């Protein structure tokens, strides 16, 4: 009867996954099967396939956070985050629009702030910044050279990110990556690392001392990206879900989607990997399923989340959890 979280069993390295295909832009498979696919195409260390360890299988079993946790080797911090927000559309639709049939002004403002974000441009911004960081670390063999290479291209590109503080989440993103300091990972050599991207959907009204309106309909001033840089301050994100509007209404607090480092230029053709919930086949929610969605399917989101952040972190180049190409389903 226990809806307790269980860790999926170990899958032999030769066991091939059962076939599955996307339907209307999204594919899904039970987590036991996705482990088989992950071991075939994502597990390589220096080109050598590996079995998903007991620890990784435990991380994965926690739900949508598990895919990103396993692929990046770290529980997501969301320290370096980007998003796009049309300030002019938000200000105009506030001072020109009107609440629809059945909306509090706190609900109208919350929705307009939600619809003013552009998740395509937000993912596009994180794309271009991650490319600058990868070029900076290409031939840099110490962090000092990486920071010098990074600032050089940002200044020549007239990117406002150049003026970030030396200890900001942006400039400290590489040195704060645990695998960067590990002797089997980066070994303090930026040229052995690579920038990767995942996304987080979450709720804006997370201040427990704020009005119930913002907890139920959103805080328009919360989690807006800074001008010029597009950086989102994720320090006040505390994994707090949207508050219910009526009794019985349940909301999920966040959602994590793994992009990696795909080379496909079409944002709409990029694949995002996420899970529905934690693994409990003997319990209420059932077994965890891993979803592989096209970008527009992922960025469609839900009413649970009014915010989207596109995060940059780093993994060693020796890994294969962020390959150039990601294929939905199997084979």
């Amino acid at each position: 009867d226990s809806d307790d979280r269980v860790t999926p069993p170990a899958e032999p390295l030769d066991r091939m996954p059962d076939p599955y295909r996307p339907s209307y832009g999204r594919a899904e498979t039970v987590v036991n099967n996705y482990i088989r696919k992950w071991q075939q195409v994502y597990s390589h260390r220096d080109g050598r396939k590996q079995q998903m360890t007991e620890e990784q299988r435990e991380w994965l079993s926690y739900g949508c956070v598990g895919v990103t946790w396993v692929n990046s080797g770290q529980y997501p911090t969301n320290r370096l985050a980007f998003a796009s927000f049309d300030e002019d559309r938000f200000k105009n639709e506030l001072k020109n629009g009107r609440p629809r049939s059945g909306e509090t002004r706190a609900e109208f403002e919350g929705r307009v702030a939600k619809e003013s974000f552009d998740e395509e441009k937000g993912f596009q911004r994180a794309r271009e910044v991650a490319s600058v960081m990868n070029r900076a670390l290409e031939n840099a063999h110490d962090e000092s050279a990486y920071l010098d290479n990074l600032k050089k291209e940002l200044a020549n590109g007239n990117d406002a990110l150049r003026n970030e503080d030396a200890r900001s989440p942006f400039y400290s993103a590489l040195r704060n990556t645990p695998s960067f300091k590990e002797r089997n990972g980066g070994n303090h050599d930026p040229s052995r690392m690579k920038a990767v991207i995942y996304s987080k959907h979450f709720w804006s009204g997370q201040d427990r001392s704020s009005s119930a309106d913002k907890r139920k309909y959103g805080d328009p001033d919360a989690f807006r990206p800074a001008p010029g840089t597009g950086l989102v301050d994720m320090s006040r994100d505390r994994n707090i879900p949207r508050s219910p509007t009526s009794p019985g209404e349940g909301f999920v607090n966040f959602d994590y989607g793994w992009f990696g480092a795909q080379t496909e230029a079409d944002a709409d053709k990029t694949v995002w990997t996420h899970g529905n919930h934690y693994h409990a086949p003997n319990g209420s929610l059932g077994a965890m399923h891993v979803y592989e969605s096209k970008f527009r399917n992922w960025s469609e989101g839900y009413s649970d989340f009014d915010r989207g952040a596109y995060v940059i972190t780093f993994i060693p180049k020796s890994w294969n959890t962020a390959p150039d190409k990601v294929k939905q389903g199997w084979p």
């Binding site: 994994n239 707090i240 909301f251 607090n253 529905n276 919930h277 934690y278």
Partner: peptide
Amino acid sequence: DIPIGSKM
């Protein structure tokens, strides 16, 4: 703590 695992 705050539960994760996407149970609403």
